[PDB]
Ligand binder design. Structure first.
Ligand SMILES: COC(=O)[C@H](Cc1c[nH]c[nH+]1)NCc1c(COP(=O)(O)O)cnc(C)c1O
Ligand SMILES: COC(=O)[C@H](Cc1c[nH]c[nH+]1)NCc1c(COP(=O)(O)O)cnc(C)c1O
Lengths: 477, 477
């Protein structure tokens, strides 16, 4: 295939390609002008029997791969939430990919587990999380584990919550089947909760009810209390609440200070989904939204959104690691080792067996930037969003139907939804920026997420002017 | 703080480090002499406020990370199954990590989905899988999707199976809770099946029954037929069978030609776990074990074991993609796009939302080696294992209690299990090779897996001699 000295040469060519790509990404159309199925006719119908040349493989990056790529690292990417890479993150995974160890148990590669434990403790401290989420605190029986997505972390929390409650019910009804007991359960989240919460219910067959929110689109204690009472009247057994800090649609925050005490009193697992907004908790001035965090049984966020670690890298912390491990535990002889009892085996904290050395890139990002520069990044992204917000606020054709707390601004043209729909359609023609919509009540809104750590005021104004140009066209039609 | 030009410098340094690391990996002790908790006191208790120097970060690779690493790329790694990296795999993922796009829908990055669809079709053809697993076959309703583990692929298959059966049951019991109907289900696998099958049952609350095997440790049709009939008499509802090709313990193969017809006739989802042995099906001469594959509803194997793609990279194919989508479907406005319904959205084929561009490394590996060289690798690995087998077979103090079909040899000292246990303990002292045990019937066995694509006859002999040294010591104790 390729010799060591050729790897050295091709590695250099790839490093130089990447440097140029990330440095000039603004010049690219963010969304590609392609139709579904475009790639098939451009590739051979079968794998090559003999080696393709590296010149051909490398040449195909621009020739057939890039033409269909959405450039997520563009400052003109404003869709979804950010997913940011960075130089240190790249370098960290280069090492991990080379070692290519697996860390299902402590024994399968001690460093894979121990670096992760220590970095997850660092990161909990950086976020201002409770000490009972630390592996190494005297009062703790919890800890943080990396996962691949918030989706999976939320599912794990639900699985652990329902397994724990089922075990409790089984002590009183040992003759009852676990799946029969599961049928009694009900879980809750905001009607602004991400679709991953619904999906977790569908996968686990746990009834999931989505609760109304206030005028700030925040889930309040009164709504949860009302739901709990109504469901107990119907013979259902409340088991789990997902409270969201930084909702997908408008980046609202559920009222943890109200929801927490209810979950504690009613014995409900309280899981916090902070996928995006968790990174803001690096900055103490944004920690008002974390008030009540002491009531949480679990917490998750994505460094793979806003903290400049490339995907996959999700943080998931639990207060009670034993509850987590009673959900998943298997014990085949071929995975046993001398230190089972003392050592952390992360296979019991996750769905699959295998896991990789994701903590190298996390460690590298935190060390290379340092905390102060990560904080400065959050603050700058937020300032760029505040600038965009001001541009929109000052234009009387537009309205801003939700508050901007961080890097997401939502807005729409005054008038029927079709105007806003047509603006998005117009912008999609040139693909010079990428935006997607959401709904609040019966109003369609455009979401504008500030993404790239390199975004400047020039980038923001450029993108606003394209949006305004599209609005001017649509309003003339 | 790290600047583009500094990335270029450090990228070069990392490439050079990786070249040297992988080239000289035999020199390393494979298993580190460390105790649990070793890392904590070597690291600061908190993240650095200011950027650490890259000299310090690089320096810490050997100083901090490597002393706790199990060297999975060593030819003297013989534990578990292989997990192989390669130069092309590394280079492919470097590109993917820089672009850092997410492919939850076609629109979120078309290339991410289309390269994967086309390469999964390549791979299905390379394995000799039925055409009904191809995306781009006119009559097909199926396709391949990448996953992170076989564990998750097996879980998804069970989730899809139980969902399908529960919907069937709802036709005659429309008011029954899905979770109540789930309680009546039973799924099957060999008693040699990997622990992920058990774990999938635990996660899903589906009853799992592990069936006895023949003298070759193969699950046979008569065992499945007997279990189905007996459980139907008990009022249980058979739903799912996992047939394993290349079992963990001794690399046995279930009798798919017998199990298939039963599953088709009895309406049971048949899922094939070929985690390790799947790569062998690149070579036509090993496809005898694949007889009956036409009856499979799903199939999974790990390129991330033996095919020289670094982890994560699991192939998962299904015959009926809509059954999968029915298990998982959600429809928030913020994930809809202009081609929804016509384009492939892989979020409906998996548990989480986000997914990354894993197909680049897979494409690069397949292209850089070409099919013939991938086949040569499998054959060479098998030849090294055959050599090891002959070394053991020539020594009458040892026995080989199961047949070697591929790169795994199992063996033990004749006599009580304690002899073999004590050989393992002796070898663990120096950690110059890594071995783990399994059980067959009442006998403890040592597993010897050939791993590194660079394994030589000299490496095999070296490792055998260390094992014999241990045996000679133990046999006179
Ligand atoms: C419309 O935007 C989304 O649905 C984003 C997609 C995304 C992923 N990375 C950047 N943007 N999802 C956001 C989201 C999730 C899903 O995260 P994963 O499970 O894929 O890790 C979960 N929770 C919240 C609150 C979100 O906003
Ligand atoms: C004792 O060794 C194992 O359990 C190996 C671990 C491993 C992973 N990569 C190389 N070796 N497991 C193998 C295995 C699995 C689990 O695969 P993942 O879910 O982690 O991807 C599943 N099925 C079979 C038949 C296996 O042998």
């Amino acid at each position: 295939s390729m010799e060591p000295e050729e790897y050295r040469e091709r590695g250099r060519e790839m490093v130089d390609y990447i440097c140029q790509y990330l440095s000039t990404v603004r010049e690219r159309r963010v969304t590609p002008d392609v139709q579904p199925g475009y790639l098939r006719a451009q590739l051979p119908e079968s794998a090559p029997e003999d080696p393709d040349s590296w010149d051909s493989i490398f040449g195909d990056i621009e020739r057939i791969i890039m033409p269909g790529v959405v450039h997520w690292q563009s400052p003109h990417m404003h869709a979804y939430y950010p997913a940011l890479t960075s130089w240190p993150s790249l370098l960290g995974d280069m090492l991990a990919d080379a070692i290519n160890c697996l860390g299902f148990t402590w024994a399968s590669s001690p460093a894979c587990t121990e670096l992760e434990m220590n970095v997850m403790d660092w990161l909990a401290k950086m976020l201002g999380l409770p000490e009972h989420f630390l592996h190494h605190h005297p009062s703790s029986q919890g800890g943080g584990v990396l996962q691949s997505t918030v989706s999976e972390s939320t599912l794990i929390a639900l699985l652990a919550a329902r397994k724990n409650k089922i075990l409790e019910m089984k002590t009183s009804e040992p003759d009852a089947d676990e799946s029969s007991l599961n049928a009694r359960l009900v879980a809750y989240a905001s009607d602004q909760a991400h679709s991953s919460v619904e999906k977790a219910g569908l996968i686990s067959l746990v009834k999931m009810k989505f609760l109304p929110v206030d005028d700030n689109f925040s889930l309040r204690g009164e709504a949860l209390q009302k739901a709990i009472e109504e469901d107990k009247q119907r013979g259902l057994v409340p088991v789990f609440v997902c409270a969201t800090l930084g909702t997908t649609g408008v980046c609202a925050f559920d009222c943890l200070s109200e929801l927490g005490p209810i979950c504690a009193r009613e014995g409900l697992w309280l899981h916090i989904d902070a996928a995006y907004a968790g990174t803001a908790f690096l900055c103490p001035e944004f920690r008002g939204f974390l008030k009540g965090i002491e009531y949480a049984d679990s917490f998750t966020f994505n460094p793979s959104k806003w903290m400049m670690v490339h995907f996959d890298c999700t943080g998931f912390w639990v207060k009670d690691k034993y509850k987590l491990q009673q959900t998943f535990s298997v014990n085949p002889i071929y995975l046993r080792h001398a230190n089972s009892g003392v050592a952390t085996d992360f296979m019991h904290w996750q769905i699959p067996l295998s896991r990789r050395f994701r903590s190298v890139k996390l460690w590298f990002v935190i060390r290379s930037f340092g905390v102060k520069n990560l904080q400065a990044h959050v603050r700058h992204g937020t300032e760029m969003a505040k600038y965009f917000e001001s541009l929109v606020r000052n234009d009387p054709s537009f309205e801003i139907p939700a508050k901007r707390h961080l890097g997401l601004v939502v807005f729409r043209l005054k008038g029927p939804n079709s105007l806003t729909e047509n603006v998005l359609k117009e912008i999609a023609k040139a693909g010079r920026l990428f935006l997607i919509p959401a709904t609040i009540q019966d109003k369609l809104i455009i979401r504008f997420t500030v993404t790239s750590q390199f975004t400047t005021r020039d980038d923001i104004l450029r993108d606003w002017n394209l949006i305004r140009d599209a609005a001017t066209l649509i309003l003339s039609q």
